[PDB]
Design a protein around this ligand. Structure first.
Ligand code: ARG
Ligand code: ARG
Ligand code: ARG
Ligand code: F
Ligand code: F
Ligand code: F
Ligand code: F
Ligand code: F
Ligand code: F
Ligand code: MN
Ligand code: MN
Ligand code: MN
Ligand code: MN
Ligand code: MN
Ligand code: MN
Lengths: 314, 314, 314
């Protein structure tokens, strides 16, 4: 199978700059080279060059609307293209708002795709419920069908068409949800596994249930959108919105090795890796490293070991 | 439902001073304000003023008997009063010896109360089994019916009447028990989940079993006495007797969100938070913060999120 | 029952020196004294004096073959002797290559022994599959029956006779396996619980399965070979090959308390504790301490507490 790396050095989704340097740190860590050592075919599409939209006034509270909107539209295009060539797309980016384009793109080629959202937050704040204008915290609100019309159209996001419905997404790791975000996920009956459920069930059963929920009836493509802050700050400190009591390094990898086994991984996002937020070079390294392991894992790397077929090592 | 904060700045239960500053740190952390944002009605009773008993000679080994005794009698009174007004009592204190008064008080109004003791220690040392005279490690010995008469009456504790029996308490997190304390809990058939059981069952099944044990036949009130040292020093370092291999930040909260769901929380204690023991301001902050989260959790705060009823966020 | 401490200050299995200082650190931590406080009879055999084999040229890639070979032959002898006196042997060593002699020795007296290998690595690299010549990573290749003849005889290891077969060993904690090592463990159908299985099952069920696998039909002696790097660097940082996402302090102890309950512990190894690798005195202390706890645990120490029989503490 084919893999296509696509860097999304974008940070306008969050007021904190830095996440744009994420792709670099990741490539710099040996991601592309390491990936190539897998049973996969790796191609690097390079980092997308996003044109800034001058005098990008804020829509009500929403910040950098047109700039985010345009960057995503370009991402959706790119991804939609690789998806058209049946290759698996990997978006290494900055803030999570790029999930808009990554999925909206993926959807154009695979409308029946399921989404497993690993994050500490729901990121489903509609532009009317946000306490800030940060779009990085609103991706899902833009991807949901059940949310269309519930909030005023935003400048730059007219190209977007709700790609999936409430019954096609599953959150994992939630532990920092707003009153509105919470109201919404409950009101729409969106399946989710907060840290409380993971504690109760254990990541083992957790993954078991998410697969039976999403792949119970039909077997469709999987879009894993991984926000590195789905794990505990002790594993991925270098991020804009760290939250205590998260997923462990182990559960993170367990999540990715399962999705690998389903043979249905179609698209992956590795977001929020900000190298400029590590209190120490060890923390940045630490973040980049596990974020790479998550990617490698998704694509076949196993903790029990891996070996090439037809090779008699004895 | 009503909540009544009651500070117990007492430290005579342990030779280390500092736990008296605990209430401050907690209030100072925004506890009262944050609590008020819950579906509850919060009232702050302020910190109790404990009169020191001069020439408080030690009873055999027991230290500051009369001083502890009197402080508790005053606490039992206070608590017994709020309990009389059907409000939920919250004791923010110093050393755990105040559990004597918090429960003995709670009991006067709710004799059928169950007790979930989250701690790294059993704290059931009778004045005859203690290696030290520290009462902070003897609360339960004073609250048990099966332990009455087994040890010599102590000066200042004549007002106390065993509030509950061996079949009404459940320990969670035990991992540092003395030969005597152990002999006792085994001899009296006191249900408990040491860290070994939590490892085996997983906090999920652990909470499951404690509720079926305590609420199996009848549904009675719950008195959660939480020793912040039920968790690992990595989460609550600022405490007098830290012990490695404890409950995780996650398990602590899982414990409190369940007890919240039972709708039976009647009384809560948040003890052993000592701000003077943090090797660094981060450690003290760290302790105070999770101790607050435990409290907020107990009273409804959910990691999956919370939202107000009748509010259409869309 | 009798316990016999045997120090194996050997480091030629790994290019990094330091693990030879391990026995010291452990004794220096109070191991022997603390052990004596158990229901066991402790005897210290002292640290073995290993004669260096001059001009010990490398066999192909294998480094210090003759030196390792000779040291092990001496260890096998020693252990085989205490085993003959029905006492339980405890090898406190340096690199894991000493597992060769510890088990080969144990085997001579108990050929039906089962082996529970707690380590982050399989250490089953045959001299033909190693990327380095480090024997510390090849112990099992020398102990397996199914591996005999699969690799060229090594200078100094002619005295060795495969002590156990693929169906007599169980790995726990694996998370850093080589292509060849992996090919081998899969090709030989060797039961193992990688960190992925532990995540899935939970150390509780994990221990459950390993006992039914190894003790299902017959009840034989247990040789627990514990490589401190089976746990996460956060617990045992001071080691030559640390790997993230390992066993927790808790799971390590849970592993040992179960093996204790089986009443079948016959032989134990506590390897890879390198005091010269702790970035800070706290890290070295931290490693030594949990390594001691693992040992004490193996021999009866319980987290729920322990008390002497026939002693009425009241
Ligand atoms: N980029 C992110 N993942 N941000 C998290 C979004 C949730 C945040 N608490 C908000 O109110 O918007
Ligand atoms: N205040 C406390 N929680 N202390 C713990 C009590 C147990 C202590 N090891 C003792 O011997 O008394
Ligand atoms: N002494 C050890 N435990 N070393 C681990 C052995 C595995 C190592 N990666 C190798 O290739 O040999
Ligand atoms: F994000
Ligand atoms: F998020
Ligand atoms: F306490
Ligand atoms: F305690
Ligand atoms: F090793
Ligand atoms: F190893
Ligand atoms: Mn997030
Ligand atoms: Mn996110
Ligand atoms: Mn305690
Ligand atoms: Mn206590
Ligand atoms: Mn190892
Ligand atoms: Mn090893």
């Amino acid at each position: 199978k084919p893999i296509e790396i696509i860097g999304a050095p974008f940070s306008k989704g969050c007021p904190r700059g830095g996440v744009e340097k994420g792709p670099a740190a990741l490539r710099k860590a040996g991601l592309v080279e390491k990936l190539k050592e897998t049973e996969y075919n790796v191609r690097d599409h390079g980092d997308l060059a996003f044109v800034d939209v001058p005098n990008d006034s804020p829509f009500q509270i929403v910040k950098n609307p047109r700039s985010v909107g345009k960057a995503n539209e370009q991402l959706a295009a790119v991804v939609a293209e690789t998806q058209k060539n049946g290759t698996i797309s990997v978006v290494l980016g900055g803030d999570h708002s790029m999930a808009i384009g990554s999925i909206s793109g993926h959807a154009r080629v695979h409308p029946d795709l399921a989404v497993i959202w690993v994050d500490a937050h729901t990121d489903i704040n509609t532009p009317l419920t946000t306490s800030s204008g940060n779009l990085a915290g609103q991706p899902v609100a833009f991807l949901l069908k059940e949310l269309k019309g519930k909030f005023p159209d935003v400048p730059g996001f007219s190209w977007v068409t709700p790609a999936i419905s409430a019954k096609d997404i599953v959150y994992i790791g939630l532990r920092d949800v707003d009153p509105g975000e919470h109201y919404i996920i409950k009101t729409l009956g969106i399946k989710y596994f907060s840290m409380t459920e993971v504690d109760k069930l254990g990541i083992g059963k957790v993954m078991e249930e998410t697969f039976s929920y999403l792949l119970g009836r039909k077997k469709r493509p999987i879009h894993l959108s991984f926000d590195v802050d789905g794990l505990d700050p002790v594993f991925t400190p270098a991020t804009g919105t760290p939250v205590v009591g998260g997923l462990s390094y182990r559960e993170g990898l367990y999540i990715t090795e399962e999705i690998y086994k389903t043979g249905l991984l179609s698209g992956l996002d590795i977001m929020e890796v900000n190298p400029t937020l590590g209190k120490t070079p060890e923390e940045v390294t630490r973040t980049v490293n596990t974020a790479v392991a998550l990617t490698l894992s998704a694509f076949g790397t196993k903790r029990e070991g891996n070996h090439k077929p037809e090779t008699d090592y004895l």
